[PDB]
Homo-oligomer: A and B are copies of this chain.
Protein backbone atom coordinates (compact mmCIF):
# COMPACT_ATOMS: atom_id res chain seq x y z
CA UNK A 1 0.00 0.00 0.00
CA UNK A 2 0.90 3.66 -0.13
CA UNK A 3 0.51 6.07 -3.00
CA UNK A 4 3.33 8.14 -4.41
CA UNK A 5 4.05 10.22 -7.46
CA UNK A 6 6.13 7.60 -9.22
CA UNK A 7 8.25 8.08 -12.32
CA UNK A 8 9.23 5.37 -14.73
CA UNK A 9 12.73 3.91 -14.29
CA UNK A 10 14.92 6.24 -16.30
CA UNK A 11 17.77 3.94 -17.37
CA UNK A 12 16.67 3.43 -20.97
CA UNK A 13 16.51 7.21 -21.46
CA UNK A 14 19.75 8.01 -19.59
CA UNK A 15 21.66 6.05 -22.21
CA UNK A 16 20.34 8.42 -24.89
CA UNK A 17 21.17 11.81 -23.38
CA UNK A 18 23.98 13.82 -24.98
CA UNK A 19 25.29 17.37 -24.87
CA UNK A 20 24.92 19.57 -27.96
CA UNK A 21 26.97 22.76 -28.26
CA UNK A 22 26.65 25.38 -31.00
CA UNK A 23 28.78 28.47 -30.45
CA UNK A 24 28.36 29.50 -26.81
CA UNK A 25 25.00 27.73 -26.37
CA UNK A 26 24.97 24.28 -24.76
CA UNK A 27 21.86 22.18 -24.15
CA UNK A 28 20.76 18.54 -24.10
CA UNK A 29 20.01 16.27 -27.02
CA UNK A 30 18.45 12.84 -27.47
CA UNK A 31 20.59 10.31 -29.37
CA UNK A 32 18.55 7.52 -31.00
CA UNK A 33 20.20 5.31 -33.64
CA UNK A 34 22.38 7.73 -35.69
CA UNK A 35 20.33 10.90 -35.06
CA UNK A 36 20.54 13.48 -32.26
CA UNK A 37 17.36 15.48 -31.59
CA UNK A 38 17.52 18.81 -29.74
CA UNK A 39 15.77 22.21 -29.59
CA UNK A 40 16.53 24.21 -32.71
CA UNK A 41 17.18 27.35 -30.68
CA UNK A 42 20.67 25.97 -29.94
CA UNK A 43 21.70 27.65 -33.20
CA UNK A 44 20.76 31.14 -31.99
CA UNK A 45 22.95 33.76 -30.38
CA UNK A 46 21.67 36.00 -27.59
CA UNK A 47 20.70 38.60 -30.20
CA UNK A 48 19.02 36.08 -32.52
CA UNK A 49 16.69 34.87 -29.77
CA UNK A 50 14.42 37.93 -29.76
CA UNK A 51 13.10 37.32 -33.29
CA UNK A 52 14.91 34.42 -34.96
CA UNK A 53 14.41 33.42 -38.57
CA UNK A 54 15.47 29.81 -38.17
CA UNK A 55 15.55 28.98 -41.88
CA UNK A 56 18.15 31.73 -42.41
CA UNK A 57 20.11 30.78 -39.30
CA UNK A 58 20.34 27.10 -40.23
CA UNK A 59 21.43 27.73 -43.82
CA UNK A 60 24.37 29.66 -42.32
CA UNK A 61 25.44 26.66 -40.22
CA UNK A 62 27.57 23.67 -41.20
CA UNK A 63 28.14 20.28 -39.59
CA UNK A 64 31.39 21.34 -37.92
CA UNK A 65 29.52 24.07 -36.02
CA UNK A 66 27.83 21.37 -33.88
CA UNK A 67 29.69 19.79 -30.96
CA UNK A 68 28.00 16.61 -29.70
CA UNK A 69 29.41 14.82 -26.65
CA UNK A 70 28.06 11.52 -25.31
CA UNK A 71 29.88 11.45 -22.01
CA UNK A 72 33.45 12.34 -22.92
CA UNK A 73 33.22 10.71 -26.37
CA UNK A 74 32.70 13.29 -29.10
CA UNK A 75 30.25 12.34 -31.86
CA UNK A 76 30.98 13.52 -35.39
CA UNK A 77 28.07 15.39 -37.02
CA UNK A 78 27.63 14.34 -40.66
CA UNK A 79 24.34 16.05 -41.45
CA UNK A 80 21.91 18.59 -40.03
CA UNK A 81 18.27 19.33 -40.70
CA UNK A 82 15.27 20.96 -39.05
CA UNK A 83 11.81 19.49 -38.43
CA UNK A 84 9.48 22.14 -36.95
CA UNK A 85 11.16 23.30 -33.71
CA UNK A 86 13.62 20.38 -33.40
CA UNK A 87 17.06 20.09 -34.91
CA UNK A 88 18.11 16.65 -36.21
CA UNK A 89 21.89 16.09 -36.28
CA UNK A 90 22.99 12.97 -38.11
CA UNK A 91 26.04 11.39 -36.50
CA UNK A 92 28.49 8.78 -37.73
CA UNK A 93 27.69 6.34 -34.90
CA UNK A 94 24.44 4.62 -34.05
CA UNK A 95 23.72 4.71 -30.32
CA UNK A 96 24.29 1.12 -29.13
CA UNK A 97 21.93 1.80 -26.21
CA UNK A 98 18.93 2.84 -28.35
CA UNK A 99 15.80 1.35 -26.72
CA UNK A 100 12.72 0.32 -28.59
CA UNK A 101 10.94 3.65 -28.87
CA UNK A 102 8.06 5.62 -30.35
CA UNK A 103 7.35 9.36 -30.73
CA UNK A 104 3.84 9.96 -29.38
CA UNK A 105 2.04 13.20 -28.68
CA UNK A 106 0.12 13.20 -25.42
CA UNK A 107 -3.20 14.78 -24.49
CA UNK A 108 -3.79 17.35 -21.77
CA UNK A 109 -4.52 15.57 -18.53
CA UNK A 110 -2.08 12.73 -19.21
CA UNK A 111 1.13 12.19 -17.24
CA UNK A 112 4.72 11.38 -18.13
CA UNK A 113 8.14 11.12 -16.55
CA UNK A 114 10.70 13.91 -17.01
CA UNK A 115 14.43 13.15 -16.92
CA UNK A 116 15.96 16.49 -15.96
CA UNK A 117 19.41 16.81 -17.55
CA UNK A 118 22.22 19.36 -17.57
CA UNK A 119 25.16 19.32 -20.00
CA UNK A 120 24.04 15.91 -21.24
CA UNK A 121 24.12 14.44 -17.72
CA UNK A 122 20.86 13.25 -16.09
CA UNK A 123 20.23 14.84 -12.70
CA UNK A 124 16.79 13.68 -11.55
CA UNK A 125 13.49 12.12 -12.55
CA UNK A 126 9.92 13.05 -11.69
CA UNK A 127 6.31 12.85 -12.87
CA UNK A 128 4.55 15.70 -14.71
CA UNK A 129 1.02 16.11 -16.01
CA UNK A 130 0.29 18.03 -19.17
CA UNK A 131 -2.03 20.80 -17.97
CA UNK A 132 -5.25 21.58 -19.87
CA UNK A 133 -3.50 24.76 -21.04
CA UNK A 134 -0.56 22.72 -22.48
CA UNK A 135 2.02 23.79 -19.94
CA UNK A 136 3.73 21.54 -17.41
CA UNK A 137 4.65 22.47 -13.86
CA UNK A 138 8.18 21.11 -13.90
CA UNK A 139 11.46 21.74 -12.13
CA UNK A 140 14.04 23.10 -14.56
CA UNK A 141 17.06 25.38 -14.26
CA UNK A 142 19.22 27.02 -16.90
CA UNK A 143 20.80 24.32 -19.02
CA UNK A 144 17.81 21.97 -18.80
CA UNK A 145 16.44 22.67 -22.28
CA UNK A 146 16.44 19.50 -24.41
CA UNK A 147 15.44 17.32 -21.46
CA UNK A 148 12.75 14.83 -22.46
CA UNK A 149 9.54 13.39 -21.09
CA UNK A 150 8.42 9.84 -21.69
CA UNK A 151 6.31 6.87 -20.67
CA UNK A 152 7.44 3.25 -20.79
CA UNK A 153 5.23 0.36 -21.90
CA UNK A 154 6.73 -3.16 -22.04
CA UNK A 155 10.31 -1.92 -22.54
CA UNK A 156 9.16 0.45 -25.34
CA UNK A 157 9.86 4.10 -24.52
CA UNK A 158 7.18 6.48 -25.83
CA UNK A 159 8.84 9.90 -25.97
CA UNK A 160 6.25 12.67 -25.70
CA UNK A 161 8.00 15.89 -24.64
CA UNK A 162 11.15 17.89 -25.27
CA UNK A 163 11.72 20.88 -23.01
CA UNK A 164 12.16 24.26 -24.73
CA UNK A 165 11.51 27.13 -22.33
CA UNK A 166 10.32 28.50 -19.02
CA UNK A 167 7.54 31.10 -19.27
CA UNK A 168 7.57 34.22 -17.09
CA UNK A 169 5.06 32.52 -14.76
CA UNK A 170 7.59 29.79 -13.97
CA UNK A 171 5.72 27.04 -15.83
CA UNK A 172 7.28 25.19 -18.72
CA UNK A 173 6.60 24.72 -22.43
CA UNK A 174 7.95 22.36 -25.03
CA UNK A 175 7.26 20.25 -28.07
CA UNK A 176 6.57 16.71 -29.06
CA UNK A 177 9.53 14.90 -30.63
CA UNK A 178 8.41 15.98 -34.11
CA UNK A 179 9.09 19.54 -32.94
CA UNK A 180 5.45 20.68 -32.72
CA UNK A 181 4.76 22.81 -29.66
CA UNK A 182 2.25 21.84 -27.06
CA UNK A 183 -0.02 24.88 -26.84
CA UNK A 184 0.16 28.37 -28.29
CA UNK A 185 3.90 28.92 -27.90
CA UNK A 186 6.86 29.68 -30.17
CA UNK A 187 10.60 29.29 -29.58
CA UNK A 188 11.67 32.87 -29.21
CA UNK A 189 12.74 34.85 -26.15
CA UNK A 190 9.57 36.86 -25.74
CA UNK A 191 7.04 36.89 -22.93
CA UNK A 192 4.25 34.45 -23.79
CA UNK A 193 1.22 33.62 -21.66
CA UNK A 194 -0.62 30.33 -21.39
CA UNK A 195 -4.39 30.21 -21.55
CA UNK A 196 -6.45 29.82 -18.41
CA UNK A 197 -5.98 26.48 -16.72
CA UNK A 198 -8.59 24.15 -15.25
CA UNK A 199 -8.56 21.20 -12.85
CA UNK A 200 -8.53 17.70 -14.35
CA UNK A 201 -11.76 16.20 -12.92
CA UNK A 202 -11.27 12.57 -13.95
CA UNK A 203 -7.82 12.59 -12.33
CA UNK A 204 -9.18 13.95 -9.05
CA UNK A 205 -11.75 11.15 -9.01
CA UNK A 206 -9.07 8.58 -9.81
CA UNK A 207 -7.04 9.89 -6.86
CA UNK A 208 -10.07 9.68 -4.54
CA UNK A 209 -10.33 6.03 -5.58
CA UNK A 210 -6.63 5.55 -4.82
CA UNK A 211 -7.33 6.98 -1.37
CA UNK A 212 -10.19 4.56 -0.73
CA UNK A 213 -8.01 1.64 -1.88
CA UNK A 214 -5.43 2.86 0.65
CA UNK A 215 -7.94 3.22 3.50
CA UNK A 216 -8.95 6.91 3.49
CA UNK A 217 -12.76 6.78 3.62
CA UNK A 218 -13.82 9.84 5.66
CA UNK A 219 -15.06 11.77 2.58
CA UNK A 220 -17.46 9.05 1.39
CA UNK A 221 -21.21 9.47 1.77
CA UNK A 222 -24.41 7.64 0.97
CA UNK A 223 -25.46 10.21 -1.68
CA UNK A 224 -25.34 9.93 -5.44
CA UNK A 225 -25.69 12.78 -7.92
CA UNK A 226 -26.32 12.87 -11.65
CA UNK A 227 -23.72 13.54 -14.33
CA UNK A 228 -25.48 16.80 -15.22
CA UNK A 229 -25.88 18.04 -11.64
CA UNK A 230 -22.23 17.32 -10.87
CA UNK A 231 -21.04 19.13 -14.01
CA UNK A 232 -22.96 22.20 -12.84
CA UNK A 233 -20.82 22.12 -9.69
CA UNK A 234 -17.67 21.44 -11.75
CA UNK A 235 -18.12 24.59 -13.83
CA UNK A 236 -18.52 26.73 -10.71
CA UNK A 237 -15.15 25.54 -9.32
CA UNK A 238 -13.24 25.60 -12.64
CA UNK A 239 -13.24 21.81 -13.06
CA UNK A 240 -13.43 20.14 -16.46
CA UNK A 241 -16.86 18.63 -17.22
CA UNK A 242 -17.14 14.88 -16.68
CA UNK A 243 -18.09 12.75 -19.68
CA UNK A 244 -19.56 9.28 -19.94
CA UNK A 245 -16.23 8.00 -21.27
CA UNK A 246 -14.57 9.33 -18.10
CA UNK A 247 -17.13 7.33 -16.11
CA UNK A 248 -16.20 4.34 -18.28
CA UNK A 249 -12.46 4.88 -17.80
CA UNK A 250 -13.16 5.00 -14.06
CA UNK A 251 -15.22 1.78 -14.21
CA UNK A 252 -12.40 -0.57 -13.17
CA UNK A 253 -11.57 1.49 -10.06
CA UNK A 254 -15.28 1.88 -9.28
CA UNK A 255 -15.67 -1.90 -9.49
CA UNK A 256 -12.60 -2.63 -7.36
CA UNK A 257 -13.82 -0.39 -4.52
CA UNK A 258 -17.57 -0.94 -4.90
CA UNK A 259 -18.21 2.81 -5.09
CA UNK A 260 -20.13 3.92 -8.18
CA UNK A 261 -18.52 6.79 -10.07
CA UNK A 262 -21.52 9.04 -9.55
CA UNK A 263 -21.39 8.18 -5.82
CA UNK A 264 -17.77 9.36 -5.71
CA UNK A 265 -18.84 12.50 -7.61
CA UNK A 266 -21.17 13.30 -4.72
CA UNK A 267 -18.13 13.10 -2.43
CA UNK A 268 -16.18 15.42 -4.73
CA UNK A 269 -19.09 17.87 -4.81
CA UNK A 270 -19.09 18.00 -1.01
CA UNK A 271 -15.29 18.35 -0.88
CA UNK A 272 -15.42 21.30 -3.28
CA UNK A 273 -18.29 22.97 -1.41
CA UNK A 274 -17.07 22.45 2.16
CA UNK A 275 -13.33 21.82 2.03
CA UNK A 276 -11.72 19.14 4.16
CA UNK A 277 -12.35 20.62 7.64
CA UNK A 278 -8.71 20.04 8.55
CA UNK A 279 -8.42 16.44 7.35
CA UNK A 280 -6.15 14.97 4.69
CA UNK A 281 -6.44 12.54 1.78
CA UNK A 282 -3.34 10.46 0.95
CA UNK A 283 -1.22 13.02 2.79
CA UNK A 284 -2.62 16.06 0.96
CA UNK A 285 -4.83 18.90 2.14
CA UNK A 286 -5.72 19.75 -1.49
CA UNK A 287 -7.54 17.86 -4.22
CA UNK A 288 -4.80 16.31 -6.41
CA UNK A 289 -5.32 16.17 -10.17
CA UNK A 290 -2.02 14.89 -11.57
CA UNK A 291 -2.71 11.12 -11.35
CA UNK A 292 -4.50 9.44 -14.23
CA UNK A 293 -6.74 6.41 -13.79
CA UNK A 294 -3.84 4.44 -15.31
CA UNK A 295 -1.39 5.84 -12.75
CA UNK A 296 -3.71 4.71 -9.93
CA UNK A 297 -4.23 1.19 -11.31
CA UNK A 298 -0.49 0.74 -11.91
CA UNK A 299 0.33 1.61 -8.29
CA UNK A 300 -2.81 0.29 -6.51
CA UNK A 301 -3.01 -3.19 -8.05
CA UNK A 302 -3.23 -4.85 -4.63
Name A's B-contacting residues (CB within 8 A): 1-12, 14-15, 115-116, 122-126, 137-142, 166, 170-172, 214-215, 280, 283-286, 298-299, 301-302
Of the candidates B7, B171, B284, B298, which one forms a contact with A126 in the assembled complex, judged by CB atoms under 8 Å apart? Answer: B7
Interface contact B137-A2, CB-CB below 8 Å: yes
Interface contact B140-A2, CB-CB below 8 Å: yes
A124 to B9, CA, bound (A): 5
Interface contact A7-B125, CB-CB below 8 Å: yes
With both beta carbons as reference points, the residue of chain B lying nearest to A302 in the complex is identified as B141
> Can you tell how many copies of this chain the complex includes?
2
Query: In the complex, how many angstroms separate the beta carbon of A165 from the nearest chain B beta carbon?
Result: 12
Interface contact B215-A125, CB-CB below 8 Å: no
Interface contact A126-B1, CB-CB below 8 Å: no
Chain B residues positioned under 8 Å from A139 (CB to CB): 1-4, 6, 299
Interface contact A126-B286, CB-CB below 8 Å: no
Interface contact A138-B4, CB-CB below 8 Å: yes
Query: In the complex, how many angstroms separate the beta carbon of A100 from the nearest chain B beta carbon?
Result: 15
Query: In the complex, how many angstroms separate the beta carbon of A112 from the nearest chain B beta carbon?
Result: 13
Q: A2 and B170 in contact (CB under 8 A), knowing A115-B9, A302-B141?
A: yes
Chain B residues positioned under 8 Å from A125 (CB to CB): 6-10, 125
Interface contact B124-A8, CB-CB below 8 Å: yes
20 other contacts beyond A2-B139, A2-B140, A285-B286, with CB at 8 A cut-off? A1-B166, A2-B137, A2-B138, A2-B170, A3-B139, A6-B126, A7-B7, A7-B124, A8-B125, A9-B10, A10-B125, A11-B15, A11-B122, A124-B298, A125-B125, A137-B283, A139-B299, A141-B299, A280-B286, A285-B285
Of the candidates B10, B15, B166, which one forms a contact with A10 in the assembled complex, judged by CB atoms under 8 Å apart? Answer: B10
With both beta carbons as reference points, the residue of chain B lying nearest to A136 in the complex is identified as B2
